[PDB]
Design a protein around this ligand. Structure first.
Ligand SMILES: N[C@@H](Cc1c[nH]c2ccccc12)C(=O)O
Lengths: 147, 147
């Protein structure tokens, strides 16, 4: 249910999430009130899920980032795993995945020793084995595409 | 130095990209001017590198997401795959990696059949083999943590 006007707003808000209603208005050719109300409607269906500053993880001390694939040590209860790892703050994302493993997390930590410690917390808190792939370099990311 | 006033700011801006110079400044103990200063400096120093609304990809036509793990076929050519792929736009994220493959892509696409197409285009444009993993569900995504 997304018309061309909304297509223009989200593409803009993707590029600039601090875009102002007035800047948006003159870009879709609408009144600042038209825009405001459009934007909240986008927001309240779950088309826009929030706004975030995109922080440099190295600058705040996260020098090591890794993908960790996790699989149930044994898969008989439905899966707690996302729920119970929500309160580990160093886990940034959590996807279920088709194939041999069940979830893939992306994880951000200060150093190698801090990674080893974190893998222990993960193994123990969701009762899961882990396969780790360290990121050496991010070429670009969250480059959100609106068609 | 990340002065733990600069530290309080980024935690604020990561949870809220449109939090406003004022509503910040209050929770931050400050003038709406030295708020505005660091914020301009924090962006200048590469610490906050941009603001983005977070759009739901289904909502916008991307019903299938995938991690796609690529390795170049000819080790005697310059290894420039991130750069060769950068204009392909459904590649949201491109990360080099220490594992079995050389990079991982997060890629978003209309349908399973559209994915087959994209992969073919990835293979012919970098000169890479592709191994891909399908995301069934995102439990959470980009929860950024500031020590
Ligand atoms: N990896 C499983 C799918 C899966 C997703 N989440 C899970 C949680 C537990 C066990 C399996 C799963 C498969 O490909 O079929």
């Amino acid at each position: 249910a997304l018309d061309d006007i909304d297509r223009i707003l989200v593409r803009e808000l993707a590029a600039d999430g601090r875009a102002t209603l007035s800047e948006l208005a003159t870009r879709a050719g609408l009144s600042v009130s038209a825009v405001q109300s459009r934007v909240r409607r986008l927001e309240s269906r779950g088309v826009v899920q929030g706004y975030s500053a995109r922080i440099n993880p190295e600058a705040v001390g996260h020098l090591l980032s890794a993908f960790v694939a996790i699989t149930p040590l044994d898969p008989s209860q439905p899966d707690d795993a996302p729920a119970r790892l929500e309160h580990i703050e160093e886990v940034e994302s959590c996807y279920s995945v088709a194939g041999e493993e069940s979830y893939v997390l992306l994880v951000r930590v200060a150093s190698a020793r801090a990674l080893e410690d974190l893998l222990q917390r993960i193994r123990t808190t969701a009762n899961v084995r882990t396969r780790s792939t360290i990121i050496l370099n991010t070429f670009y990311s969250d480059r959100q595409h609106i068609p």
